[model samples]
Target: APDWVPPEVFDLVAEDKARCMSEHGTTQAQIDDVDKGNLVNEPSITCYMYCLLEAFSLVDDEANVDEDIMLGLLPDQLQERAQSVMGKCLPTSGSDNCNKIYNLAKCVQESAPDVWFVI
Candidate 1:
């Protein structure tokens, strides 16, 4: 969560608090930081956060915007930030590919106006 992941990330957690802590730690922190206008400086970090969110289902499967899923997946405090990220970074539908996630991540990075980056 802090950087890449704890070795334990591959392992399953038994409870909610650990689940939240392990699951969203790095990616969510990055999103929260980005939303507060903390790091609008790099292409890699910003999109990487979104990609992580999608992988974790914090965002949708195809990267389209969806408020319900966002609201359900995130905590009350993070819901708005996740929604804003979805609004700004939602991907247009297209051909499916092995690297579609990476493509979408790049798209989000390129699409965002200079406002934030990863922190």
Candidate 2:
């Protein structure tokens, strides 16, 4: 189920992807692995997650997931799914944004295929 994300956002995502990959050397395979709960220990992975969260408006400067901002980025049809996913994935009190983002991406990949980082 590939939902139709806004064109502007899709473009921004692609741009961010390139920025992260070029600047941090994060490969697509690493991203896919992190999104599926397979990796997330290296500094580059965390930096890449930081880049993505900023681009997607999922977190703030404090590395905390902002619920409103997060939900606002999704298509209307996916608000509930995103909400449920965040509820289960978002970290409560931790500086490890990468871990949280990994869980969050896993949730998106498993439950909402539409927004699962289609490149």
Candidate 3:
């Protein structure tokens, strides 16, 4: 996790990570690669991200991102930047839930590379 993320956030991420990984057949190595900013469009990893967002209610059934909830999860230091990114990346669109998150992640990374991370 990033240094700015609170310890409690790590706990929540850990729980979701386990569940999402199992559900999506994602391996720890794939998740670690994403944490290092090496993202691919593979469903195993992308679906895991969608699952995590859904678990937090940051996204809906159709994979539409809830900007307010997403911004609320970040530290105050990141909220403004995140809001800007959300404005550009939101209303996620793709072939599937996982694909939607993959697009969103790519969009965000284009503007704010450090903002996307897997815990």
Which clashing pairs does model 3 show? none
By summed lDDT, the worst window of 10 consecutive residues in model 2 runs over 92-101
- Enumerate clash totals for all models, in the order shown: 4, 0, 0
Higher-lDDT candidate of 1 and 2: 2
When 1 and 3 are scored with TM-score, the better candidate is: 3
User: How well is each residue in 31-113 modelled by candidate 1, as lDDT tens digits?
Assistant: 46654545543434434544545555555665554557646744565556656666765554435321443454544445543
For candidate 2, what is the lDDT?
A: 0.68
Using TM-score, give the best candidate's number: 3
Across 76-106, the per-residue lDDT of candidate 3 in tens digits comes to 9998898888888877899999999898888
How would you order the candidates by lDDT, starting with the best?
3, 2, 1
**Model 1 bad stretches (over 4 Å):** 1-67, 93-97, 106-119
Model number with the top lDDT: 3
Q: If the candidates were sorted by their TM-score against the true structure, best first, what order would they fall in?
A: 3, 2, 1
10 residues in a row with least lDDT, candidate 1: 9-18
